[PDB]
Amino acid sequence: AMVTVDQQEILNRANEVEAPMADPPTDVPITPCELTAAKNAAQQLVLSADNMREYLAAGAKERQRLATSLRNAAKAYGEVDEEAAELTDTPRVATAGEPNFMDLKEAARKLETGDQGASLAHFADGWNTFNLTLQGDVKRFRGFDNWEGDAATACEASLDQQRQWILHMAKLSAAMAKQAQYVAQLHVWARREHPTYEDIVGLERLYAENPSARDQILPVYAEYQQRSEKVLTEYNNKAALEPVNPPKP
């Protein structure tokens, strides 16, 4: 292809491509409650978010490397001119062993103790906002106006791949935010459906104190036990989050 070069345009675009992007958020996702499933979901998010940040750092390095390439091209056009005169996957938090049933009071105490998903929601807000930030940070990968030919085209192909990488990272930012929101919603659902500590207390106290009530109260206690088991089983299932494994830049 017939070559056109604007050396200054190349140098400008080098500066532009490596200009800082906003840093990802650092909110720590805290477990919504004391259940092992809730703790495991929050740990899985910590690990996924850490790896996302490490991959985002590697992306910044790649933008620096592309800037250097462009500056080396700019220089080489000047030379000919003169002469003519460690990234890995995210660990999976093991969820095996989580109890699907428990003493009632213990299960209710664990569900009721903790921030109930406030931290998870804040985590999701930051990563959602980062998704939109990244989407706004791709003009730097556009084509050239006055650099044409094979080198320009090769550069444009690299720029295109970095654009696609950023947008894939934006999608994963949104996906990981959705995981946190999903576990927060799961937790609110579990509170709606699991018997409360105090409801369980009241029933057990009446049972203990009133022998003639026991035969007729027991089915209420059994319904509570059974509903508790269903809720804990579903919490264990649904809180198991897939690790986020970003693409290498």
Closer CB to Cl ion, 85 or 94, in the complex:
94
Q: How far apart are CA 3 and CA 48, in angstroms?
A: 45
Q: Give the whole-angstrom CA distance, residue 228 versus residue 110.
A: 12
* Nearer CB in complex with Cl ion: 35/42: 35
Contact 118, 31 (CB under 8 A): no
Site residues for Cl ion per CB under 5 A: 35-36
Give the C-alpha separation, 16 to 135, whole Å.
Answer: 16
Number of Cβ atoms within 10 Å of the Cβ of 150:
9
Specify whether the backbone of 153 is left (phi greater than 0), alpha (psi in -120 to 50) or beta.
alpha
> Which position's Cβ is nearest Cl ion?
36
Amino acid at 16: E
User: Which lies closer to Cl ion via its Cβ, residue 110 or residue 140?
Assistant: 110
| For Cl ion, the closer CB: 36 or 43 | 36
